[PDB]
Structures are given as C-alpha cells and as structure tokens.
Design a protein around this ligand. Structure first.
Ligand SMILES: *Cc1cc2c(cc1C)nc1c(=O)[nH]c(=O)nc-1n2C[C@H](O)[C@H](O)[C@H](O)COP(=O)(O)OP(=O)(O)OC[C@H]1O[C@@H](n2cnc3c(N)ncnc32)[C@H](O)[C@@H]1O
Length: 431
C-alpha cells in the first residue's frame, strides 16, 4: 500500500521557480511532512534563471480559456488576503491600452469578457486619451492619440522575486529540504517497472521519493520528451534609472500595457523602471536530447542569462523597447537601458497549462506550460498541482491541463505569429 500523506515523499524539480515553489508551499500547507519534501533547482530559490525572479509582474485578470476565471479569482483573493503574499501586491490598477482598429476591437471584446465574468465593478472602459490621462496623467497626450483602455481598479503589479523569496523562507523555516547547483540540476527520473521512484542530478546525486513533480518552466521540454506540447520562447526587458525626483512623480502609477507597444511599471524602491515590449517571443532551436526521446530532436532550448550573463537582447528588441520608452515616457526617450536580458517561458498550443501525470512514468507529474501568463498564479497554482498528485483535481481543470500532444502548434500558440528564432535576431550574444 502507498504511504499516507504524512509519509509521502515528493521531489519538486524546479522548486526554486514559480510553479515549483507554489507546489512546495501547498504540499506543506496540505499536510505533507516538510522534511519529506525536497526542492531541487539549478539555482537557489529564487532561481537566477526563473522567469519569476523579476522586479515586477503585472497582476490582472485576462480570460483566454474558461478555466482562467477560477484561477484568476483565487490568485486575486490570495494576493489581497494571504499574509505570506499580501505585502508584494501593489494594487495600483492596470491600464490595458490599444490603438488601431484591430487591437481596439479585440480590447472591446476583452472588456466584455471581464464584465461577463462578473468583474464589471472593478473594470472601466476608457474611450479617449483624456480618460486614460485621468488614471495616468504622467502619460503624454501627444503619444497616446486615439488610444483606448480598460482600467482594472483591482489590478496592479507584483514584486515577483520578493514573493518567491518569501515562499523560500517559509519552506526553509518549515524544514523543507533543498538541493541546488550540481545537487539540484535534474537530468533524469529514476524508473523501476515503469514507476518513477526518484531522480538523478548532473553531479550524479540520486534522490528517492514516492512522487516527482517537474516544474522546470521553459526547461521542461528540454529535460523530458513532451512531443512539442510545450515550445519555449524568450521575452525581453530592460531597466532605466530615474532620479529620486523623477521617481517620486511616478509613485503609485498604474501598470501601463499596450499589446502593440509593451508595458512598464512604477519605479521600485531603487528608482528603477522595468520596461518590456510585446511580441510573439523568440525560440532558440538546437539539437538536444530530452530524457525519453527516441530520435534526434531539434527543440527550443533556453539560452539562459544566468548561464550566459554577458548575453543581452536582440538589436531589434533594443529598438522596440526604446520605441516603447519613447511612447510611454517621451521625456526619458534618451535614457540608456541596462540589465537588458532575455526571460524564458514555455507556450502550449492553447495557452492553458500542462499539469498532468506522465502517461508512461507513474508518479512523475508534469507542471509546466506557463504560456507566459502565470506568475500571477504563484499563490494558488501549487494547490491544484497537489490536487492532481492526489487524484482530486476538478474535471474542468484536469481536462484543460491534460497530456495533449495532439492539441496543435505551440510555436504559434495563441499569439499573433510563430516565434522567430534568436539565430535570426542578432545582437544578444557577446561570447
Ligand atoms: C519572460 C517574462 C514572463 C512574464 C512577464 C514578462 C516577461 C519578460 N510578465 C508577466 C506578467 O506581467 N504577469 C504574469 O502573470 N506573468 C508574466 N510572465 C510569465 C511568468 O513569468 C511565467 O509564466 C512564470 O513565472 C513561469 O513559471 P514556471 O514555474 O513555469 O517557470 P520558472 O519560474 O522559470 O521556473 C522554472 C524553474 O525550473 C528550474 N530548472 C530549470 N532546469 C532545471 C533542472 N535541470 N533541474 C532543476 N531545476 C531546473 C529553473 O532554475 C527555474 O527556477
């Protein structure tokens, strides 16, 4: 007979990242024994290369699939009410803007989706640049002519790295086991009679456990064979430095987002604004053999900034990010970004998660497919990974997250185009 929860060991691979750390957290909250939970990561939580290890992420509701609503409401409640998480949600509002007929029409539909989801009280439609300037007067009326916007009063931004770090502290305090670097870098599941009984890391260290979760984000499909259910892509950011005087003006600013332009955040406590552009992401295809592959594989393998910290971003990205600064913050259009880096996610075809047991390897569970939209689910997602581990995951969640190699083309996913490849977008490499 299988051990009871109190005696069930679980290895969480990628446990220094977003979904992994959440999974570890909820294992403990769910009454697994902390010392029976092992978090393994290539880098100490919060992992240097985790997409969650960031200054700032957007908190907001975005409804791409039906299951999105439930997950978003859970997340919102916890960012507002959970003592572990509350202090890292800055409820400054979210300004989701569009310009041009196509983008504006899509926004109008997005707005109505939010209403129909029951969020009318916390979302308003802004039908002119004047309405927009009321929620964010530091925008230039020159630059945002003909823009419209949804303002989500209930949105804002998340101090991402800090939130994960507080999860790490909690796990540490509770007695969770850690292995990092060589001791934490997953290479293979250990298998017996078609059952997963642990993992081996690059330094040869073996961990034995009743259950294994693979929450390795953009590395997941590089680590085990996922038949292109996930395709990993990079987005880009840079930082600009404000004087204390300049920063003070932008204090408590709503997040500003435009799908055709990018997005930026109020200054952190160091006077630093993070800016991203928006685009369909970049692959970096190469030859690589994930565990369980039965043929030569060309797949998108993250070019990790943590591994290659001299890397920057493509020249085209430097250009697009600068035009974003020019548009959003024209008075700053002449600042030089620094800390420019690529940040890695993995897209499924339908942009829903992949959270499911491996069809072959009993007790090995996938928890990835973040599809670039999942940091906000830090608080709650781990709970459902536990439900899946335990066989209690709701049918609608279970279906949406299921093993589905047949599902479609992740390279394009739900985005405007197939991702281009870093090989064809020069200027990021300085080896
Ligand atoms: C890139 C990006 C993503 C992003 C965003 C802006 C950018 C530039 N803006 C967002 C926003 O405003 N709001 C939001 O909700 N999400 C946003 N995203 C996406 C978000 O960052 C990601 O969807 C999410 O963080 C992904 O989480 P996940 O847990 O899937 O991935 P991770 O945090 O990267 O964790 C992966 C971990 O796995 C470890 N790893 C890798 N290889 C190994 C091996 N071999 N062994 C053990 N561990 C491994 C990594 O170290 C990492 O910690």
């Amino acid at each position: 007979m299988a051990p009871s929860r109190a005696n069930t060991s679980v290895i969480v691979v990628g446990g220094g990242g977003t979904i992994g750390s959440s999974t570890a957290l909820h294992l403990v909250r769910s009454g697994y024994t902390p010392s029976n939970v092992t978090v393994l990561d290539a880098y100490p939580i919060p992992s240097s290369q985790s997409a969650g290890n960031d200054l700032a992420k957007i908190m907001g509701v975005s409804l791409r699939n039906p299951v999105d609503l439930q997950l978003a409401l859970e997340a919102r409640q916890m960012w507002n009410e959970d003592e572990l998480f509350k202090k890292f949600f800055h409820n400054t509002g979210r300004l989701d803007c569009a310009h041009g007929e196509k983008d504006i029409a899509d926004l109008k539909s997005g707005y109505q989706a939010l209403v129909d989801a029951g969020l009318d009280a916390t979302n308003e439609w802004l039908d002119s640049e004047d309405e927009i300037l009321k929620r964010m007067p530091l925008l230039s009326r020159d630059q945002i002519k003909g823009w419209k916007a949804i303002f989500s009063k209930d949105g804002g931004w998340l101090a991402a790295a800090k939130a994960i770090n507080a999860v790490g502290e909690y796990l540490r305090d509770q007695g969770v086991r850690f292995g990092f670097y060589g001791a934490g870098s997953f290479k293979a599941p250990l298998l017996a009679e078609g059952v997963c009984i642990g993992v081996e890391t690059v330094d040869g260290t073996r961990y034995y456990a009743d259950k294994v979760v693979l929450a390795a984000g953009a590395w997941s499909p590089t680590l085990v064979e996922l038949h292109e259910q996930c395709v990993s892509k990079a987005w880009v950011y840079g930082h600009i430095q404000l004087t204390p005087e300049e920063a003070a003006r932008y204090k408590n600013s709503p997040v500003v987002y435009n799908g055709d332009v990018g997005f930026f955040f109020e200054p952190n406590e160091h006077g630093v604004i993070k800016v991203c552009d928006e685009f369909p992401g970049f692959t970096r295809f190469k030859m690589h053999q994930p565990f369980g592959a039965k043929a030569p594989k060309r797949i998108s393998v993250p070019r990790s900034h943590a591994k290659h910290p001299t890397d920057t971003i493509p020249d085209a990205s430097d250009v697009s990010i600068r035009r974003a600064i020019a548009t959003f913050m024209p008075q700053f259009k002449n600042k030089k970004m620094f800390n420019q880096a690529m940040c890695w996610c993995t897209d499924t075809a339908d942009a829903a998660l992949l959270i499911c047991e491996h069809p072959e390897w009993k007790n090995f569970v996938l928890a990835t497919g973040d599809s670039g939209h999942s940091f906000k689910l830090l608080p709650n997602i781990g709970k459902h990974v536990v439900e899946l581990l335990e066989g209690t995951l709701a049918d609608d969640l279970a279906h949406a997250w299921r093993w589905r190699p047949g599902s479609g083309d992740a390279l394009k996913s739900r985005r405007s185009a197939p991702a281009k490849d870093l090989a064809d977008m020069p200027g990021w490499n300085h080896d």
